[PDB]
């Protein structure tokens, strides 16, 4: 009973509040996609999908004080090895001839420890996810490279990468389980290169209590009163 144009109207104030709190390239993108929705039920759905995730990933960057990287400028695995572990990068090509798809894997966040974005403590991140998971039962999956059964060491430091996977989908467990299965092969590859990498993965959905997401509640309200409402109104009308 409501035409696309009318829906984008009723959801103008809820959406202005969304673009206001996002990072620039995030607000800027989610704004283009909302004008393709106003000028769109399929094509509109397709754009409202990308806003759902791009907006979540900007609030995720905000919550964790990380940097929002638009997909066009996210690094691949081969890019992180090339820059961060150049002495092994050629060997990172040899062992990836039967699985060259590995080279272009592109997570939401490809971090490395302060010698690809840089983070203070890779271990401090993994513990904050493990803490929330344990305290709120929020499904996460984590993996860590480990050549043979090697021990950590206190007399030398090593470069290391952090691979984060986030997502705003209704099947949370399936996403974390499917994310961890995709990085599993490359994690085993890193073990055989002597490269220390950690893979995190998590997901929220709109049924999660607002006080228990991976983004602050203030950003949950912003997401619910907009991207979600627009989706309800998009199926109804």
């Amino acid at each position: 009973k409501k035409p696309i144009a009318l829906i984008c109207a009723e959801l103008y104030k809820p959406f202005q509040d969304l673009f206001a709190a996002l990072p620039k390239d995030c607000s800027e993108e989610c704004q283009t996609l909302f004008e393709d929705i106003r000028n769109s039920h399929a094509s509109a759905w397709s754009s409202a999908l990308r806003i759902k995730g791009v907006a979540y990933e900007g609030f995720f960057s905000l919550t964790n004080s990380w940097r929002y990287i638009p997909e066009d400028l996210k690094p691949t695995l081969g890019m992180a090895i090339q820059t961060v572990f150049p002495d092994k990068f050629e060997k990172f090509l040899e062992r990836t001839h039967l699985h060259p798809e590995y080279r272009d894997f592109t997570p939401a966040y490809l971090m490395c420890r302060s010698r690809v974005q840089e983070v203070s403590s890779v271990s401090a991140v993994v513990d904050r996810f493990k803490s929330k998971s344990s305290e709120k039962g929020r499904p996460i999956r984590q993996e860590e490279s480990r050549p043979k059964t090697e021990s950590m060491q206190e007399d030398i430091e090593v470069d290391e990468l952090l691979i984060v996977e986030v997502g705003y989908q209704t099947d949370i467990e399936g996403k974390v389980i499917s994310d961890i299965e995709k990085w599993k092969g490359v994690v085993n590859l890193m073990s055989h290169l002597g490269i220390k990498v950690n893979v995190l993965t998590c997901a929220d959905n709109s049924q999660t209590p607002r006080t228990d997401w991976w983004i602050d509640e203030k950003y949950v309200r912003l997401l619910l009163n907009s991207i979600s409402y627009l989706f309800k109104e998009l199926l109804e009308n």
Partner: antibody, heavy 118, light 113 residues
Framework: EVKLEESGGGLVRPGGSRKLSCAAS????????MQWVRQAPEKGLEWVAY????????YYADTVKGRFTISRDNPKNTLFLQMTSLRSEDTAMYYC???????????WGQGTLVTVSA | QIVLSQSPLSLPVSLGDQASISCRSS???????????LHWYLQKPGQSPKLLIY???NRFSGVPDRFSGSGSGTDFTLKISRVEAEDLGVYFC?????????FGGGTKLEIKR
């Protein structure tokens, strides 16, 4: 001078429990991984557990897994070993040790003797 | 687990002579960070163990220079250039490259008389 002073040994019935402590002095205890090692009478050295400086990493000998817990209270400069479901083969001298910058056993205590027997 | 094989089991040595103790590793002790975590300890009778050498060849502070270590990969040696009476005891090689950390079974150095 670096010093590690263990306490907590004595007699323990099979299946019983015991908590061993180790007091560190002479170095900034909070920055270094600490370890337990043991030695059964007339035998060799056997590693028991390692705990990182902020307790994030813990390693266990396969023979003590699920029975021994290692921990530390850094503002108190102390290292612990909770031992549970003890067997007669746990009869040993127990030592705390640290590398003071490595995973080797640079500094040792004098050991404390734990006898598990009825 | 990483098994460390010490030979000989016992080593009779006359005062002033050299001694070499040998530690063979069941796998390489080269750690991916570049270091080799193979270490040597002396336990004198009745006392707690003492670190002699760490990371193959670094002599620990306070350790007399008659003690040295060499090797790489899976083959390592401890040398006592000139044996003193005090060196009586059991010598242990240990690895901390891999979990579980492990020891050889010990070489008893006896003084020849």
């Amino acid at each position: 001078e670096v010093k590690l002073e263990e306490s907590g040994g004595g007699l323990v019935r099979p299946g019983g429990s015991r908590k061993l402590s180790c007091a560190a002095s002479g170095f900034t205890f909070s920055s270094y991984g600490m370890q337990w090692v043991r030695q059964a009478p007339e035998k060799g050295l056997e590693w028991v557990a390692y705990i990182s400086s902020g307790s994030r990493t813990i390693y266990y000998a396969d023979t003590v897994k699920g029975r021994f817990t290692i921990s530390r209270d850094n503002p108190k400069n102390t290292l612990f070993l909770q031992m549970t479901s003890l067997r007669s083969e746990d009869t040993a001298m127990y030592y705390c040790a640290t590398g003071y910058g490595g995973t080797w056993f640079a500094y040792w205590g004098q050991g404390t003797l734990v006898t598990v027997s009825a | 687990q990483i098994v460390l094989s010490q030979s000989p089991l016992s080593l009779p040595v006359s005062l002033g002579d050299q001694a070499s103790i040998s530690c063979r590793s069941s796998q390489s002790l080269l750690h991916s960070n570049g270091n080799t975590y193979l270490h040597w300890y002396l336990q004198k009778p009745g006392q707690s163990p003492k670190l002699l050498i760490y990371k193959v060849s670094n002599r620990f502070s306070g350790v007399p220079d008659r003690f040295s270590g060499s090797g790489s990969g899976t083959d390592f040696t401890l040398k006592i250039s000139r044996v003193e009476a005090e060196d009586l005891g059991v010598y242990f090689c240990s690895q901390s490259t891999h979990v579980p950390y492990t020891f050889g079974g010990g070489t008893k150095l006896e003084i020849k008389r």
